[PDB]
Amino acid sequence: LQHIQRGKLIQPFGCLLALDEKSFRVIAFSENAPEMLTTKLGIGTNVRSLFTDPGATALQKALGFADVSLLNPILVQCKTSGKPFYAIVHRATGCLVVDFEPVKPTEFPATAAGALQSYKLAAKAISKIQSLPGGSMQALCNTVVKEVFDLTGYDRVMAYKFHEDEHGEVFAEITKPGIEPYLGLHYPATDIPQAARFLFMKNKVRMICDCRARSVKIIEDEALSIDISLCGSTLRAPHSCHLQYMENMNSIASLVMAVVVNENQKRKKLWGLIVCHHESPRYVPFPLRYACEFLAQVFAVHVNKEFELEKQIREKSILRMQTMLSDMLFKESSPLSIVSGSPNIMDLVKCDGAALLYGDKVWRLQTAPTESQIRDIAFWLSEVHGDSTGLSTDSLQDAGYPGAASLGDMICGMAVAKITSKDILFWFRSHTAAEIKWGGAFLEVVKMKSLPWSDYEMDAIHSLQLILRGTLNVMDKFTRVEGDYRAIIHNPNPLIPPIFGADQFGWCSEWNAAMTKLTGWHRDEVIDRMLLGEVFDSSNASCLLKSKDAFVRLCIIINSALAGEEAEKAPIGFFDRDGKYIECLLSVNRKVNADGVVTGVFCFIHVPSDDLQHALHVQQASEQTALRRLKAFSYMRHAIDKPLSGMLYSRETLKGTDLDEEQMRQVRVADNCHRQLNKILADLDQDNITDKSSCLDLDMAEFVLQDVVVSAVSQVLIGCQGKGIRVACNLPERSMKQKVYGDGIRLQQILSDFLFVSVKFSPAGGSVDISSKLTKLIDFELRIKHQGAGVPAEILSQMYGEDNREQSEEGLSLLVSRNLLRLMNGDIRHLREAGMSTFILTAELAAA
Amino acid sequence: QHIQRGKLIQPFGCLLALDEKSFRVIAFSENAPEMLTTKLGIGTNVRSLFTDPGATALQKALGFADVSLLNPILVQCKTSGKPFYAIVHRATGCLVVDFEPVKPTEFPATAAGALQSYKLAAKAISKIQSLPGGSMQALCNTVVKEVFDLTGYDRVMAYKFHEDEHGEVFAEITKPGIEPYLGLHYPATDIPQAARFLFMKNKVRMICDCRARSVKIIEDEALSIDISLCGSTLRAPHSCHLQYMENMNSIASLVMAVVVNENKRKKLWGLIVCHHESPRYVPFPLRYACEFLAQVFAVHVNKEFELEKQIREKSILRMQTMLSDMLFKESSPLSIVSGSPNIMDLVKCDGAALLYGDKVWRLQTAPTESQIRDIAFWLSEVHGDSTGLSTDSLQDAGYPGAASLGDMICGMAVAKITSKDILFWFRSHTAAEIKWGGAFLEVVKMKSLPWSDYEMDAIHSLQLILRGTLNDKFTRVEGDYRAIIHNPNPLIPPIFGADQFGWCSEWNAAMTKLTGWHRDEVIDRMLLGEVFDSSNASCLLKSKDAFVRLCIIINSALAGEEAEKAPIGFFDRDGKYIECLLSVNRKVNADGVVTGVFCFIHVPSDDLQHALHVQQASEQTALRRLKAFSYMRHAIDKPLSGMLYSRETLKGTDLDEEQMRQVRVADNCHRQLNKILADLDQDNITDKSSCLDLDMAEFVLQDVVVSAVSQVLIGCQGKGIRVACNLPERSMKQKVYGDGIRLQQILSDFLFVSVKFSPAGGSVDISSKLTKHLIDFELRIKHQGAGVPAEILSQMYGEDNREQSEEGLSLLVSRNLLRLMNGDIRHLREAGMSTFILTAELAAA
Ligand SMILES: *[C@@H](C)[C@H]1/C(=C/c2[nH]c(/C=C3N=C(/C=C4\NC(=O)C(C=C)=C4C)C(C)=C\3CCC(=O)O)c(CCC(=O)O)c2C)NC(=O)[C@@H]1C
Ligand SMILES: *[C@H](C)[C@H]1/C(=C/c2[nH]c(/C=C3N=C(/C=C4\NC(=O)C(C=C)=C4C)C(C)=C\3CCC(=O)O)c(CCC(=O)O)c2C)NC(=O)[C@@H]1C
């Protein structure tokens, strides 16, 4: 690191000057600076003398105030020859470094700069980043790398990712055709030393022009007791080993940006780097570098948003299983009833199988070891781990179980639970497959390791332990993570939601430990009292409410629950024994008897976090009842189904009777278009509505393309007859009859959409010609040619931008056609020649 | 005064007094010994009077510190087991027990608690909780109707107290033959303040009969402390109350107070007064149920109070936005007369005028030019010191004239921007009249709506803006003729702006007040980095993410797209966090070159901010759902054209006659499908009115019924349901005139809903009858098993069933269509089967 700070070298693509703040006089200068700055500069020269007034005034004004990086690009004209330069000044402890870069004359009209030009060029890459739905890191990385690729034009663009063990993994990348990819690789922690990361925290952009270019030394004043550090400057020479490492990667001009993410003024850590590479020397102007840095910043912001979304998603699962536990405690849960009923031991935690040993009998679910070896497992647990109870591990071999060959490769992670000495519970998980490529290229495989058991997932099992043991009614139990061969002791705190109840006459009858903690009132001080008036009241009670309106609402809720209709999550709030306001969500379940007489209520409370209490819990209630559409044509979706069934039955009866080839082909065409109709309405499910591009799967089937083409013609031939146009399909017979494997319905929809567009846009007397090409995997090419004015420019531009909400019906439809086409690695090519319009469709199919 | 001194009770129940500690009787009613024993002198204990259970319960209830929680205590007397409700009150250091007879009508009352009283009145609460808010009259009507249904009294009203304590009958429900009293105002002296205090103490007052003589209570000679039975429900009526009761032609009554929080402090909104022509009795559980209903109504009043505040705040925000827009483009005094933001929308009025450059411009209803000159002269002469004035009235305002001029104008607001030029706002009078039952009337035709303080605040702001853009002393009398008050505010939003290079170039005074900085300390500095920066600046932001978002907002605004109401937050000079909304508008010169931005900041209250956030988050889901559904609606079209083509070919091709009917059924089904898609006509009106444009043409009913059957034959086969159609061939095939396409849907959706709930192995029987030219068509569809659930059956019986389920909606629409052509639907359930009877009127061919 000290060599980097104390080194005096620069790249030959610019010049460097050192000025004194109090005197504005040159102290040190680049060796090549006099040669193309005066095409004589010396120590103590005044920078005003050697630069023209329009630029010298700007430079002198910029040198004044401290925070000088606000207007960094200063276009400056040399007095001697009038060559344009970019002046970029960096503050330092008495150094005041200045960098001059040569402007590219090809964009000389770009005079007049500032931090506001060509960041309107990064506006597209920002406005299309914002439009992505969240929850998908891979999509965000793909979009970011693709936009950096498009903006900069470098060969390779990557998204280098740092893991918890500071080892790099290429998360996403894009590259020019004809270049070897590097996606999926993994790199050790020694590639990027801590000095590089410490520098990238400070200098967020690093750029190198040529790897083989010779560095230029810098001379300095002999009276300088303090060396001029070039750490701030962007003209610093490459370091003695970075050069060799990038030489081994066959790269020359790399451009590296750092992504800074809060560690979770918060502490901030590097999520990774954006690294652009090239094979030949390359140069980039300053505004593009600034725009890319700003793009990295907004990428980091969206990464933070993804972290918050993941935290909320993880938080909701606490409430879900708390509700499950409350439901399991509401009814008397026997060890027999738990295994059979719907809230079984297969949904308490995400597990691959479950088992139960009690009453000297064994029950299993899904995948579990047989009756023989499960008793040996119980015996081993009893002998080795006698005093401590509760075990969790992801590998029986790591613990040291002797007999595991009989179990097999599957069923590797084991979690146990002990209600008492004999009766015990089992959860069984299967080990996953891990595969990482190092390429320092060798393959590394790790087997027989299952997913780790989170302390949350053991707290759930502990709560189930307590519930079952209390219902059946061993002491001071302690469980182990078994992360390594050494055994460490848990401190598992249970979580059971606060629960209280009242009988049919309104007297309080239940007050458990969680409520005792929440309110502070011990059970003995609240029981045998009126629930509404003596315990919960706004005037004189143990837990005062906010106001009389809240008490009235609570009475309404309790009485309505006693009447038959049960609440699910009603927000309430009250003051505890210490006077602190508590806000929570209360739910009441009616309690009935065998004879059908209501005995009372059974209320339980879970308190979510403030962020979760607001978002999606108060803001959202069926989108806060966005019932605007719920009447308009929502009834149509239901009402159109029955006539569809009517004509399916009609077509079945039609095909039941004896018909020759001519009618059979038409019946097949009908059935094909009806299947297309059912398929398109199949996508109308809310699962594909919440996220439009969520499900992108296809139906594999064997089909003949001739039927697809015939139906495509027939779906628009009515309009063709209406406008009196002729459609000709010049397709070879032998190639058209060969079966293919794929989804002909989606290609059918796409073609038919293109034919509809062409027929609508072509006036009367026109012609449509469809030609087919089969290349041998089968490459299918379809050319549709028509005459007329062609597709209007506005619709073409609309259909070339998916994010455009101005999407006309034709434009939206064509965008969906391309989105479907991209699934099988297809592309649409539009050509306009002599006024004729040609559409080229490419597809890949599996030969039968 | 003597609200507690009177030792008289209405003889419909007994009363006893009990010592605080000894639990012994001191005083008893004169009729108590006869109704409780047949000695009842100074008895030793009340436990020996009643049987064990009741006596034990009464002793326990007397034991508790709080007694109001166990008011209904059913007790029995050992003499003959007469059931008595025993209500216990605890006041003035003594207990008072009231025993009301339990009528043998409802001998198994089984209430005995404050829980069955609620369940007596659950449906009314459910009705009130479903009403959309914002309308007080609908809530009053619903509450009074539910109370009328519950109690069963002849006459009921809601009695509303105004600010001057004069009471108005806001609503009323009466049985036929009773003179209505709606809207008749009453003097404020009808209700003395003692009654209001009692109603704030006791929420129920009930009188069985106003003519029956009262009886007294025998007090203990030894005791020297009065019972003071003020809190008991057996208190006798007051004499003047009796006179006003007989004045109102009511003989029995029961009233309940409505207490709402006043803006914790609470006040009496009014009463819910029930009246009868003959003496009536109501048992205690019904009284408690109605009191709880009154409490629910009082709860629901407060949110209607809050909605008005939210509306007012939104209006203030909108006018601030209008003021900012007016400042955005330099507005000359001559630009507001004809431009889009004219002086009409600033404050509600009926006309406007302007006098600039000795030229007069008028808008909407306003006096003539000479009258404008005379008003200007009188304003200059009489009030020369004032520069802003507003009179609700002009005849008595001190202006000689405007009497024979007329013009139907009373209110006038005038603002003086400069020495000799003024704006105008003319307001026409509203016909106001009140009617006093005790009838007479008071009519005022010379007073308009008053000038609100905020409506003058707007005028002051507009005057300031115009004076500033044309370019001290601030006096503004807003009293008509007698009063004089002054000191209005600007309420101009905080405004700032940045040059095209990012340099700050404008800092409003309101912004100075909001942030604490000064214009000279912030001008000519970079807006992003030196003024609004996350690390070292004048007004620090929360974090780097907020700074990046603000940079994105400003740069996007400079690019030609404007942001409105984007939430931001920052620390002021004193370290106080401020959360507000920012809106940026691009500023473009007349040559087509932009020259910076122009930002202004709203500061809504927390509740309004929460509501705005909720609505802004909610609208997006509806937008995307609409977009997706429109795509789906368009994309349906393509394959139906192909199916129609193919069916046309099949019909064209030579085919036997037996499939002619099959192809016809298909085509009928397809055109029926086309019908609903063609029903994009403004959310079809349906109901009885609906669209009377039903297809009028000849057809065959048998084909329609066959198509309807085939529409559900697939589901019938799936579930293995056997369908029998016993239709007479001669009658079923007879030609008729009318609509058959809609009838197909009417029979098909009913068949589908019958099939859906059909148990496995069930059977469906369909019969058709023709009555005789006009033919009455009767279709009976019978299926076994339970049948349609009661919820869907009710939701088909009527249309007011909250949100409507898909099958329920379909059946509703079917009922509307049936009612269109004089048809009706009847459902019968007898011994585990459901049958639907469908009646239609058709014209025979
Ligand atoms: C004589 C001194 C004045 C007087 C005295 C008085 N009034 C009350 C109580 C009530 N007055 C009521 C008035 C109305 N009832 C109606 O039918 C309507 C309107 C539709 C009116 C104006 C009512 C009702 C009450 C409240 C009690 C109730 O029974 O509901 C009292 C107190 C009596 C008591 O002992 O509680 C007194 C002393 N009222 C008058 O109007 C005359 C001029
Ligand atoms: C020298 C013996 C070791 C070494 C030293 C070293 N490396 C850097 C900096 C970088 N190395 C990078 C590596 C990668 N980028 C990629 O695209 C890939 C793979 C596809 C990898 C692994 C990156 C990134 C940098 C930064 C480049 C930049 O321009 O800053 C440094 C710091 C140099 C400096 O600028 O101070 C040093 C000392 N790297 C090695 O792996 C060898 C063994």
Residue numbers in the entry:
A (entry chain B): 72 to 110, 123 to 347, 362 to 537, 559 to 591, 743 to 1045, 1054 to 1125
B (entry chain A): 73 to 110, 123 to 347, 363 to 537, 559 to 591, 745 to 1045, 1053 to 1125
The authors write:
Phytochromes (phys), first discovered in plants, are red and far-red photoreceptors that are also widely found in bacteria and fungi later. PhyA is distinct from other phys and is responsible for the very low fluence response (VLFR) under a broad spectrum of light and for the far-red light high irradiance response (FR-HIR). In higher plants, phys share a conserved domain structure consisting of an N-terminal photosensory module (PSM) followed by two tandem Period/ARNT/Singleminded (PAS) domains, and a C-terminal histidine kinase-related domain (HKRD).
The PAS2-mediated dimerization interfaces are highly conserved between AtphyA-Pr and ZmphyA1-Pr. In contrast, because of a smaller tilt angle in AtphyA-Pr, only marginal interactions are established between these two structural domains. This is also seen in ZmphyA1-Pr, which has a tilt angle comparable to that of AtphyA-Pr.
